[PDB]
Structures are given as C-alpha cells and as structure tokens.
Amino acid sequence: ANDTVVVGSIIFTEGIIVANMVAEMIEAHTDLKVVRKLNLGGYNVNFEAIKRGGANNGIDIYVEYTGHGLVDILGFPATTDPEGAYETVKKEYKRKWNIVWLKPLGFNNTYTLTVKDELAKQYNLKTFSDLAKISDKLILGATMWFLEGPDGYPGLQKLYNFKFKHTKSMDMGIRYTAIDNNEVQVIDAWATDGLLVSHKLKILEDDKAFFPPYYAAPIIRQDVLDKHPELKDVLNKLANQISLEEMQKLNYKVDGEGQDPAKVAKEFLKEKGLILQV
Numbered sequence: 001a002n003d004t005v006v007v008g009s010i011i012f013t014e015g016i017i018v019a020n021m022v023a024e025m026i027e028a029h030t031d032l033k034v035v036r037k038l039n040l041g042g043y044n045v046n047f048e049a050i051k052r053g054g055a056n057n058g059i060d061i062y063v064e065y066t067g068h069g070l071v072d073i074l075g076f077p078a079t080t081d082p083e084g085a086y087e088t089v090k091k092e093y094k095r096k097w098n099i100v101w102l103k104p105l106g107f108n109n110t111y112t113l114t115v116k117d118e119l120a121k122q123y124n125l126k127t128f129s130d131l132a133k134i135s136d137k138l139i140l141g142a143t144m145w146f147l148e149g150p151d152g153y154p155g156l157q158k159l160y161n162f163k164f165k166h167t168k169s170m171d172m173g174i175r176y177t178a179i180d181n182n183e184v185q186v187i188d189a190w191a192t193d194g195l196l197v198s199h200k201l202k203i204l205e206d207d208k209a210f211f212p213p214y215y216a217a218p219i220i221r222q223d224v225l226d227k228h229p230e231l232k233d234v235l236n237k238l239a240n241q242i243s244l245e246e247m248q249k250l251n252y253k254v255d256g257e258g259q260d261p262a263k264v265a266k267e268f269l270k271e272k273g274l275i276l277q278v
C-alpha cells in the first residue's frame with residue numbers, strides 16, 4: 001500500500017537532472033513514491049547498485065549510457081553505431097542480469113577532446129590525429145572518470161599515441177575555467193556539458209572513431225517491472241524527448257545560472273507537457 005522505488009545517479013549535473021526527471025515522472029503518473037539516491041564514484045557504480053536493488057541498499061532504476069555499458073560487456077573499447085550499441089546492451093543486460101533497457105532519451109553525451117577555438121585556429125586543429133601530432137607541447141586537463149574509465153583516456157591514448165606534456169585530473173566545473181585561462185590547453189569536454197555554451201571551444205573530430213555512442217536511457221530491474229508494470233510506459237514517455245541542445249540548456253541552467261537541478265528537471269517536464277502544471 002506504500003510501495004517505493006529507488007532512483008539512483010552518480011554525482012554530476014546531467015545525471016542528477018535526468019534522475020530527477022525519472023523520479024518526477026514516476027510520482028506524477030503512478031502511486032509510487034521515490035527515494036532519490038546519489039552514489040559516489042563513476043564506472044560500474046550504478047550498475048552494481050542496480051544489481052543489488054532498492055530492497056538491498058541499492059537502486060531499482062537509473063539512466064545509463066549505451067557506450068558505458070558496452071565497454072563493460074566487451075572487456076575492451078570498441079566502436080559501433082547507435083543501434084549496435086543499444087541493441088547489444090539491451091539484449092545482454094536482459095539475458096545476464098534481468099535488467100531492462102527502456103527507450104533512449106534522445107541525446108548522445110559522448111566524451112570529446114576539446115580545445116579553445118583560438119588554439120585550433122593557431123595550430124590548424126580539426127581532428128584527434130592533428131592534436132596528437134602536437135600533444136607533446138600541450139597540457140591535458142581531464143575528469144577523473146575520463147582518466148580512469150576503461151572506455152576513456154587509457155585506450156584513446158594508446159590508439160592515437162597521445163603524449164601530453166602534462167596530464168592533470170580536474171573537477172568538472174574547474175576544467176572549463178582552467179582551459180579558458182590557458183592553465184591547460186585540452187579538456188575532456190562532454191558533449192552535453194552546460195559550460196560548452198559559455199566558452200569559445202572547438203570539439204575536435206574523433207577521426208579513428210575510438211569512442212562508442214553514449215546514448216542515455218532509463219534502465220530498470222525486471223522484478224520492479226513485474227511488481228509495477230505501469231513503469232514501462234511511464235518512463236517511456238521520455239522517449240526521444242530530450243535533444244542534445246535541450247540537455248545542454250538544462251545543464252547550463254544549473255552550472256551557469258545556479259538553479260538547483262530539482263527545479264530545472266521539474267520545470268522542463270512542465271514545459272514539455274510531460275507532467276501537469278501545478
């Protein structure tokens with residue numbers, strides 16, 4: 001009579017916004033109440049938590065990215081097209097873990113390598129290969145998740161033979177300040193990052209196609225769907241409802257304009273008519 005589900009996120013702006021959207025949709029369209037949980041860390045943290053489940057100090061639902069799941073299935077970085085990534089993780093997670101991938105939200109939040117526009121013009125940079133030829137002169141500032149993830153810098157560095165003068169691990173917001181001030185020359189910008197809006201940066205082309213697609217989708221434990229089958233349709237109301245530009249704008253409302261992510265998520269859903277006004 002008082003059933004609850006746990007929606008998890010790791011700790012970054014987009015993750016919390018989209019987890020909040022999932023929680024708001026569930027509470028708007030079902031009789032379930034939602035525990036919102038934040039998990040410390042990056043790679044495989046939400047995956048392990050959902051394997052435990054909300055009844056065992058874990059989570060029942062979170063928004064995963066196809067490429068992050070794909071690299072864990074394969075055991076080595078590989079590239080593919082959006083459908084290849086999505087269908088592979090959907091079938092594998094269902095068969096191995098009884099985890100259900102719902103429909104993609106609509107955006108691809110990939111890792112990138114990004115430089116200031118002026119630096120790109122100064123050195124004629126368009127591609128990762130262009131950058132690698134001169135990386136020995138440059139400093140990379142990047143997030144811990146990118147530097148430590150199996151699908152992040154370790155394999156990219158080996159494939160392109162990147163040789164930066166110095167490589168610094170940085171918090172998410174401050175790497176944008178650091179590249180704006182030329183404390184570093186390259187950052188691992190993420191494609192939906194809010195602060196890409198306010199900095200004059202150039203996203204370089206991954207010409208060897210190292211990275212897989214990173215399409216966000218809600219995923220849920222099958223036993224939670226068995227108990228509450230309505231969830232499937234409710235969460236699929238978000239299907240293709242968030243473009244890259246929309247997600248970027250929401251992220252900037254938090255990171256650039258100081259709004260809290262709960263407010264940003266709820267007002268977005270109200271604007272799009274996905275939940276009721278008032």
Ligand SMILES: c1cnc2cc3c(cc2n1)[C@@H]1CNC[C@H]3C1
Nearest residue numbers: 042043068109110111145190214
């Ligand atoms: C480990 C686990 N999940 C991640 C999710 C994301 C990232 C890194 C992760 N690393 C950023 C790049 N892909 C989508 C977001 C943001």
